Amino acid sequence: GAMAPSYRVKRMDIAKNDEECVVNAANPRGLPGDGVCKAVYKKWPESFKNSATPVGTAKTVMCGTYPVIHAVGPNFSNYTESEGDRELAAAYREVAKEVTRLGVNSVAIPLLSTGVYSGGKDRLTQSLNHLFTAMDSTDADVVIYCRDKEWEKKISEAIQMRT
Ligand SMILES: O=C(N[C@H]1CCS(=O)(=O)C1)c1cccs1
Ligand SMILES: [Cl-]
Ligand SMILES: [Cl-]
Ligand SMILES: [Cl-]
């Protein structure tokens, strides 16, 4: 584990992360997809061999020795707010189990269900809070990746508030 486990946020492409493993914001069918998923496909295409997995789950596939944890958040266009909230929390709990099993000291993670799966709603606080609930009991250094300047500021504020 990390000597003093921390949370940090960076505004940049997660495909250029400086961590020991990455979490992909995957679709259930293991397709190249869009956004983070397409960037992950271009950087680690080998990790998409048998990566299909249901909503609310995570499935790890190596690219060489580098782990890619495919986490499938719900598409809020399809689920009700109640059911989607439950599956979003579940996807993050499965990420925590995989990070622990892998024994890594750091992990790069995006905010699940905040892009094309958001159903057109701002889900920063909802997704980030489920990320904290799952990852708080792990000892890996967590680095959250985002692309928007206002989101970077809000995530950074939420991290610092708890310290
Ligand atoms: O790329 C994202 N979501 C993926 C869900 C499956 S997909 O439709 O292929 C795109 C992101 C999540 C957060 C920021 S971007
Ligand atoms: Cl970048
Ligand atoms: Cl998304
Ligand atoms: Cl963002």
Backbone angles phi and psi of 8, in degrees to 5:
-140, 160
Q: Is 145 annotated for ligand binding?
A: no
How many other C-beta atoms can be found within 10 angstroms of the C-beta atom of residue 15? 17
Distance 48 CA to ligand 3 centre (A): 18
What residue type is assigned to position 99 of the chain?
A: V
Q: How many residues does the chain have?
A: 163
Q: Is 143 annotated for ligand binding?
A: no
Cα gap 150→146, rounded to integer Å = 10
Cα gap 30→56, rounded to integer Å = 14
Distance 4 CA to ligand 1 centre (A): 30
Minimum-distance ligand 1 atom for the alpha carbon of 147: 14
CB-CB contact of 156 with 9 (8 Å) = yes
Minimum-distance ligand 1 atom for the alpha carbon of 110: 13
Minimum-distance ligand 1 atom for the alpha carbon of 32: 9
Q: How many domains does the chain have?
A: 1
Range of 118's domain? 1-163
Edge to edge, the sheet with strand 66-71 lists 7-11, 141-146, 106-110, 22-25, 66-71, 58-63
